[model samples]
Target: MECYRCGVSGCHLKITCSAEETFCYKWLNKISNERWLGCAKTCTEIDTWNVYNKCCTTNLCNT
Candidate 1:
């Protein structure tokens, strides 16, 4: 599925998530202003998993 990775305004990275579950990811680092989409799966320990029920608005919603 299409997913957002880094915060590049349009970093549409093709990744995998649970289709059965809903997760609107946006990882925000509290220590620094650095942030990225949940699918990035970067620094999971430092960043918080900002998940939502649904946030897709179009076909590219996966990203």
Candidate 2:
């Protein structure tokens, strides 16, 4: 699948994940409210006082 990609500059591009990578993920830093997006082989939902992680299975879903 295709997913959004982010870096120090933040989300601005896209990527086609490898066959082995079937998920899109987004991470949130509660402290800074900064977000990061990428493709992943697997994803598990996570939430806490200082961070949150989300995963999806559709194209560009991380956005």
Candidate 3:
């Protein structure tokens, strides 16, 4: 699988995931406006007052 990859800035690149990395992960720090995008073996959506974590499956899905 493939996923978007970026940190702090907007995503402009795609990454080829490893065999075990079946999920696309996105984490957003609401207070700092910081964002992370990458691949993961497993991920679950997490929403709170300070941040949000998102997961998906598909090419560049982290975006």
Candidate 4:
């Protein structure tokens, strides 16, 4: 999986979403409401709603 990382720390890298989970993820900061998008092999512990843990399929589909 290919995703775009845009924030204070921005770096593009190849990722793989395997196992039970099947999708990419983007994190929305509660404070800034910024989207931290990335591929997800494992689900991170964050807010399900509020765009914090927004999951999607396809390449760079972090919206």
Candidate 5:
């Protein structure tokens, strides 16, 4: 997966939420291609583990 912020692969930050799931720092955002697409296509594709449900939440504050 690529981080839209840093434009790097495999993300650079890790987040542990209330669910105890470790999320990469690229699952957040509500737009892409300068349009309102919600979390960008690259973000969404990486957010999923099995083509269903979100695997993590983006922690922009941490990074």
Candidate 6:
């Protein structure tokens, strides 16, 4: 996936496995509420909701 606000590419907040969805740490922790909505508006996707939070479990998506 890609960050609509930063233009940085990454994956969706929730990943599908066995038809189940899991939260993506890349966005869970790195993005902020304001930025998340911004990203969603920019990207026009619900996954951007993950980008609105303020904490990422891993540094892989930090930039």
Tens-digit lDDT string for candidate 4 (1-63): 565556565545445544444567777778777766666666565775454576677776764
> How much is 31 displaced in model 5, in angstroms?
11
- For every candidate structure, what is the RMSD over all alpha carbons to the true structure, in angstroms? 7.0, 1.4, 1.6, 4.3, 10.4, 11.9
lDDT by residue (1-63, candidate 2, tens digit) is 799987676697899999888899999999998887888898889999998999999989886
Residues 1-63 of candidate 3: C-alpha lDDT, one tens digit per residue: 889887445586788999899899999998997878888998989899988999998888776
TM-score of each: 0.37, 0.86, 0.86, 0.51, 0.18, 0.15
Clashes of 4: 0
**Which is superior by lDDT, 3 or 5?**
3
Question: lDDT for every model?
Answer: 0.45, 0.88, 0.86, 0.62, 0.32, 0.29
Q: Please provide, for model 6 over 11-52, each residue's C-alpha lDDT reduced to its tens digit, 9 standing for 90 to 100.
A: 333322221211222234335423331122112123453443
Model 2 lDDT at residue 18: 94
User: Candidate 1, residues 1-63: lDDT per residue as tens digits?
Assistant: 445556456556545655542443554555564555643222223323542222442224544
Tens-place lDDT per residue, model 5, 1-63, is 222233334334333343343343333333332111112322233333323223334543323
Task: Indicate the TM-score of model 4.
Answer: 0.51
How many clashes in each candidate?
3, 0, 0, 0, 0, 5
Tell me the lDDT of candidate 3.
0.86
Model 1 off-target regions past 4 Å? Answer: 7-10, 39-63
lDDT of 3 at 51: 85
Ranking by lDDT: 2, 3, 4, 1, 5, 6
| Window of ten residues with lowest summed lDDT in model 4 | 13-22
Q: Pull out the clashing pairs in model 3.
A: none
State residue 55's C-alpha deviation in candidate 3, in Å: 0.6
